[PDB]
Design an enzyme around this catalytic site. Structure first.
Site, mmCIF file in Angstrom:
data_model
loop_
_atom_site.group_PDB
_atom_site.id
_atom_site.type_symbol
_atom_site.label_atom_id
_atom_site.label_comp_id
_atom_site.label_asym_id
_atom_site.label_seq_id
_atom_site.Cartn_x
_atom_site.Cartn_y
_atom_site.Cartn_z
ATOM 1 C CD1 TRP A 73 -2.674 1.637 0.412
ATOM 2 C CD2 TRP A 73 -2.355 1.617 2.645
ATOM 3 N NE1 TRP A 73 -3.511 2.610 0.983
ATOM 4 C CE2 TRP A 73 -3.351 2.591 2.349
ATOM 5 C CE3 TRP A 73 -1.990 1.415 3.977
ATOM 6 C CZ2 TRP A 73 -3.963 3.392 3.365
ATOM 7 C CZ3 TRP A 73 -2.607 2.205 4.998
ATOM 8 C CH2 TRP A 73 -3.571 3.184 4.680
ATOM 9 C CG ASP B 268 -1.780 -1.504 7.595
ATOM 10 O OD1 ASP B 268 -2.853 -1.371 8.174
ATOM 11 O OD2 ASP B 268 -1.544 -0.943 6.522
ATOM 12 C CE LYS C 12 -11.129 -1.017 2.083
ATOM 13 N NZ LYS C 12 -10.496 0.303 1.957
#
Length: 411
Positions: A139, A221, A257
């Site tokens: 990312w 993460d 999410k």
């Protein structure tokens, strides 16, 4: 005279935005957007989790609430619940009071607060030279956040192997064995972004071993816990394994999410230490960092998540809601793989189902992607990344046919 803004150039559009804009514009009726940055249903619609709607009603009707400033570190119940979610209610670290949490502006905010802290207090004081290892690829925010925090030496570890369509575990381990002692390693806890392939629990054991021996700092993460497999424990396995192995670490958590709260920017930074006392010092410095930068925190997303996770009944309802998303993605992976294999598509396709989470590196090359976008009006990134939730019962055959044509006509 001229405007002082007269020579300001038009900024170049950004590919993730432009891809969706191109899709929008396209008059072709076959068009499919596999580039949406969020969960979509089988009918291509946003999905508000039922438990979130219920909790929003409770909050709105709670006349005890005010709008005064939260503590600088954030809503206490949110921080405690978020940490409990990652670590598990029976974590030794939570029992031994060697955990802290800091509310953040999404997962990126949690990574930034952690980075700023490391740049000030870790591996010496004001040491911007500690190497920071990120996956290849990863990312973009991983590199960008640590760059912005002032880290001068950002490195890759090998991860995706395009030939194999899978994990270069040996390269990853080799890169960790060559890492200077005390280097920071940014680890995707589950649902690797952008590829979707994760280490298996046994592979995580190997990664942990090298990290332990070289005193490497884990920075997890955790952007997709529960959303990836539908099972919160499973999704936090590596995190909880690292605790049990005696690691100190940070873990950036995002709730976009897994609560569908994309427009609330809710995150937490969990800190796990060897001992309770220095955790309090750590949090005293993270207060200064929050204040000195950002300064928040906004309450509403945090309140939603706290009110859900703190309540055993809403927590169960939420795990159901999250599992429905995860299960639809898992189904779509299975269906895509089955359809590609039924078409006798060249290559292996086990990667489609070995991967986990909303994103998949399909293994297509850029010219294959270009065939999809331009000839078939299927919008995805040139890396081959698709949002698996862009697949529906209605478009699967069109997508699978189109991929088959790409692999057999191109290269």
């Amino acid at each position: 005279p001229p405007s002082v803004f007269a020579e300001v150039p038009q900024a170049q559009p950004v590919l993730v935005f432009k891809l969706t804009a191109d899709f929008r514009e396209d008059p072709d009726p076959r068009k499919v957007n596999l580039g949406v940055g969020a969960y979509r249903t089988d009918d291509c619609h946003p999905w508000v989790l039922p438990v979130v709607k219920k909790v929003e009603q409770k909050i709105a009707n709670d006349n005890s609430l005010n709008h005064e400033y939260l503590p600088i570190l954030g809503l206490a119940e949110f921080r405690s619940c978020a940490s409990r979610l990652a670590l598990g209610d029976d974590s030794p670290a939570l029992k031994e009071k060697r955990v802290g949490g800091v509310q953040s502006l999404g997962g990126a905010g949690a990574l930034r607060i952690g980075a700023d802290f490391l740049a000030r207090w870790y591996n010496g004081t004001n040491n911007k030279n500690t190497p920071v290892y990120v996956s290849s690829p990863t990312w973009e925010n991983h590199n960008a956040v640590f760059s912005a925090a002032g880290f001068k030496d950002i490195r890759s570890y090998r991860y995706w192997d395009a030939e194999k369509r899978g994990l270069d575990l040996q390269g990853f381990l080799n890169d960790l064995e060559n890492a200077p002692e005390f280097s920071i390693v940014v680890l995707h806890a589950c649902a690797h972004n952008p590829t979707g392939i994760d280490p298996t629990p046994e592979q995580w054991k190997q990664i942990a071993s090298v990290m332990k021996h070289r005193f490497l700092f884990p920075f997890f993460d955790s952007a997709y816990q529960g959303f990836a497999s539908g099972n919160l424990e499973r999704d936090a396995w590596a995190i909880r394994y690292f605790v049990s192995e005696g690691f100190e670490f940070f873990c950036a958590q995002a709730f976009s999410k897994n609560f569908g709260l994309y427009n609330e920017r809710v995150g937490n930074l969990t800190v796990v230490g060897k001992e309770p006392e220095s955790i309090l010092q750590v949090l005293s410095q993270m207060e200064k960092i929050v204040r000195i930068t950002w300064s928040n925190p906004p309450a509403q997303g945090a309140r939603i998540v706290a009110s859900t996770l703190s309540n055993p009944e809403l927590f169960e309802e939420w795990t159901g809601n999250v599992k429905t998303m995860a299960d639809r993605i898992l189904t779509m992976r299975s269906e895509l793989r089955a359809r590609l294999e039924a078409l006798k598509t060249p290559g292996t396709w086990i990667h489609i189902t070995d991967q986990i989470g909303m994103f998949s590196f399909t293994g297509l090359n850029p010219k294959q992607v270009e065939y999809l976008v331009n000839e078939k009006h299927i919008y995805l990134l040139p890396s081959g990344r698709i949002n698996v939730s862009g697949l529906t019962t209605k478009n699967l055959d069109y997508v699978a046919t189109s991929i088959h044509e790409a692999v057999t006509k191109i290269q």
